[PDB]
Amino acid sequence: IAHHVDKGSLYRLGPVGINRLLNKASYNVINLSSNTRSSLSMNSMLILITIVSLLLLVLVMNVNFIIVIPVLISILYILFS
Amino acid sequence: MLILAIISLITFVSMSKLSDNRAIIRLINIYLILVLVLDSFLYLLFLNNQTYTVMGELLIFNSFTFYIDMLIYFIMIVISSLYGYNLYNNNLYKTLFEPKKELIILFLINILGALLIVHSNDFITLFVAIELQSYSIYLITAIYNSSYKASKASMLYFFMGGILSILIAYSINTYYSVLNSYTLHSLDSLIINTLDLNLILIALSLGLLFKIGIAPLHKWLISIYENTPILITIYISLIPKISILSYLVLSNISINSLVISILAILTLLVGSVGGLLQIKIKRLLAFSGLTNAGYMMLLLLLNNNEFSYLYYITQYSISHLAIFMIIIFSIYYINYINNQYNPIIYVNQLKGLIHDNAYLVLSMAIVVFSFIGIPPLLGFFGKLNILMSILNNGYYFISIVLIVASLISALYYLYLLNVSIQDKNNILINSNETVSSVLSYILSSLIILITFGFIYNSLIIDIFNVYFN
Amino acid sequence: IPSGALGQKVPHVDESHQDLLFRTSHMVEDLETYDEDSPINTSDANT
Amino acid sequence: SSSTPLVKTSVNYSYGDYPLIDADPHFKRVVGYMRPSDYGVIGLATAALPAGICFAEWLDPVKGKFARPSVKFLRVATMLGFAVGFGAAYARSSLRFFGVTENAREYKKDEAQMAARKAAGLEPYGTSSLTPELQEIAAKNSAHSIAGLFIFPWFNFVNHPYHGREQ
Amino acid sequence: ALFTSLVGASGLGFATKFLSNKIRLKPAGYYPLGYVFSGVAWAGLGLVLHNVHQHSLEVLEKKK
Amino acid sequence: TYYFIEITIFLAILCTIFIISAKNPMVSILYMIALFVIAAMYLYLIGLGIFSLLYIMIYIGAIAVLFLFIITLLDINSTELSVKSNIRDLPLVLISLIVLTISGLMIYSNDSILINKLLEAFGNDYNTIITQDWFNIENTTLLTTIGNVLLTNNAFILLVLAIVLLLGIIGPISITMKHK
Amino acid sequence: MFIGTIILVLSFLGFVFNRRNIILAFICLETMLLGINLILLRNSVLFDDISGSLFAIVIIILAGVESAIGLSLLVSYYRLRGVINSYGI
Amino acid sequence: DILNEEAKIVQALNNQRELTIKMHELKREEKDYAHSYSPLFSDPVPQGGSIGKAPGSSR
């Protein structure tokens, strides 16, 4: 209990696992714009992606709201990982 | 009376030499003070939420917008004090904190364009004022042109502001194509039911909001805030935020919007976990602005959000202003000055600040715990009154995402504290020259507001009750 | 060890980070030294 | 002909406790009806800007040790001080026309003056050199322009027929 | 009470004068006349805020 | 001479494609000047003969002259439209073309229905009936009414616009002087 | 509405996928403003009013001033770097 | 002596609760055009565009 439960798995749901999750999620969202030599082409393609993607999402989303929850979960997965 | 100052000022500045610039700013500083003191009795016009429209339904003047212009003048008095007063009389701080000849011109033209957004009733007033303040931020960014980073930042800000201004123009003329009108006073509670104005009004709000730095399109603004020098970036971070958000809160065109709720959740997420592993203090300091603009995107969904808004606005303004002024003051104690425009960059450079001027760390700790929302301080009641409006109106998942975002954002706020209360080997004992009396009094005023401003909450709620209801 | 709000390794930035191997590195615009505006990097800028 | 207002308008819609005088007074009436305390406010602001610059130099001097500011700064300070004082006095005096502050001193003057203009056999608010369309648009521009004194100065110089009153 | 409001706002002025002295790495009573200057200024702000709340209460009771 | 508007629409498409794919940077800018001329053709075509000459005076005669003047005495590198560079772009170009095109066509419509919103943009076929009424007695053309409403109802917009023109004077000077 | 919509959309996508130089970005910005003008002036003609013509004559002037401002911004970008890169700023 | 001083505080807190519920009612209440828009020129009727005007254009 003192090793595998209290120092083991109650820290994985606590301060030791959250540090690793936030380390990975922060690394991914900082490397979101690591790629291109260009500042301007990067950001102006990034503006295009969202005003396309949001419009596509609401096109899905007034049809049915159930089929757009996993789309947003997958967008969070590729954004934070 | 801003117009008078601009008209007087460019006349006066064309004839001054460059030796006189700093003193000119001092003049304008005192001028704005006597526009606050001698002219604020106009609050008596706005009893019981009496609203005026001026210039033929062109501008709208209520008490909300009166408070916003008072706030913008107070902040301009602080910023112009930062330019017009010396920190120290060294040959160091003269080559670091030096105003250009045309800096206060662009300051007052930007304050003009920022006021004509919040005071605006029609869409072409909104457009002309947005471009007035946008060209002013282009030129305020580009005015320290002997700098590679500020030049690249002004070019980037030009193109990314041009796109999002053409998106606002497209939304305005798209609104015009379905309604022969320019007002949102045209809407009047029945048209929204029988007309799909959703896509129009949301695209308008989005084109207005991407200039603040909301989350899908946030990185270009974080790069502009890191690349600009340390005095410019305290002004260009604050003024478009409060002007555009004070427009979009006064006009309630995105009430219960699904897109604004998506982007508010995403803003609270990416600002909290975005600035965690970051080692530059203006980066760290700009993701704080990203989260605190998320907390406003929340109030955009709201109907009747004027208390939570105005309280959290002057909260964030005082806290923002103070945390930039504290790291202006910490430049005297760092062992390494690079980069003449931006002399402190890395947040580990303030490492032994408790052993050199411990009361600067008392200052810092107060404003950082108010950023977190600790109850004796003023940021707590801002977050509290935002929660009282979020929960009143049915945004239950948004509430828990707000709480998790504030808990995650507390980490990199406390990282400033964790660095500054630490051991350092070579500490100061005896320093000959002093910090500015005029300018350290301003930082102490900004702290005493944050700590002892919870006293006046009930007075402020009663004065609220009379002038807005 | 300097730490970086998650217990991570962060670089201590002294004057020794702007050489010409540190010139135009591959990196994010965060966590990057070699500023372009430095009294050792300009050093007869418009002469 | 050239005085029918041809619109529908507030009648005695007072903005405070006290009854209104005008919904936008003419510039001549505001300069005519201002109190000696208002001229004291103008003198206060004219004195406070150069004294304020001298004060702020005495607190923190520009080049390290204290000198008086130049006379070229003191004269611009005095000009802008008269600008602040005139804006303050115009706003103060306009508040009495709107009925948001005490105006029993000026209410007597207006009933005396409109009785005089009835006795002289002319129009109650002045003959204007404008068509009534232009009078109406010109007074939609300057209606309640004392709010927003912080942004821009704007005044009423048109003799238009309507001022939020009856008969 | 008006007097308690004035004395408390003057205490806020004393606090901001003290804290600005101590940021400057001065002693506390470095310049002792700035204490009365700051106290009179913040007490004047308290005077303004008290009068505005008073007029506000009178407007609220006039809706009887 | 019916299909004139269709012809200007098609020629404008073709001119933008020649703008974004051009050897030399100023070959691209001359295609932009040609697009301004196609615009002024469309504006005379629809009935706005005043605006077309305003476009030729302001956009061609000042903005394009400033632009060509910039390209002359400044050095600008340019890659040309390699196929290795830009067909990595093409799938998102195609998706965003169809989506942004349909979406720009979407907001002229009021339906609950998605593609009734779309195909009411193509319900164009009906020929407007122009009637004569004899109610107007004078030569108030369009420039006269722009001068009436810039100057009476929107006089404040004209004066804030004067501040914008002032800023366009002050700013470029303030950048490029290097005071002593 | 067709000509203004398609010049705005093609102008926007030519701006977005510009990787070749910087002045293509400027001229794609100006052609975007042209397309906005086209849509608005057609709506003013169809609705029989000047108010779209009012916003159009104001946005002409604002487009001119933005071109002047931004090209001085490019000149100051060029002052310290006597070259403008092909990939961008 | 203490029950009365608690009933005084309870009355003073129920007064604040009544005041708060009232001031919440007051904002959601609809409001006049003369109070919401500018007071002078209280009618929403535009009558705009007065040079080449047609008789029969009013309704």
Ligand SMILES: CCCCC/C=C/C/C=C/CCCCCCCC(=O)O[C@H](COC(=O)CCCCCCCCCCCCCCC)COP(=O)(O)OCC[N+](C)(C)C
């Ligand atoms: C001679 C005086 C000259 C005028 C001075 C004006 C300076 C403008 C400064 C702005 C930033 C500094 C905070 C000051 C907050 C003032 C609160 C207030 O009074 O704002 C009101 C409530 O605000 C609201 O809803 C919400 C406001 C939230 C405030 C939250 C911060 C609380 C703690 C700081 C304020 C208390 C400090 C008092 C220290 C003695 C709304 O507008 P009012 O028409 O009634 O204004 C009237 C103020 N007059 C009379 C001085 C003109």
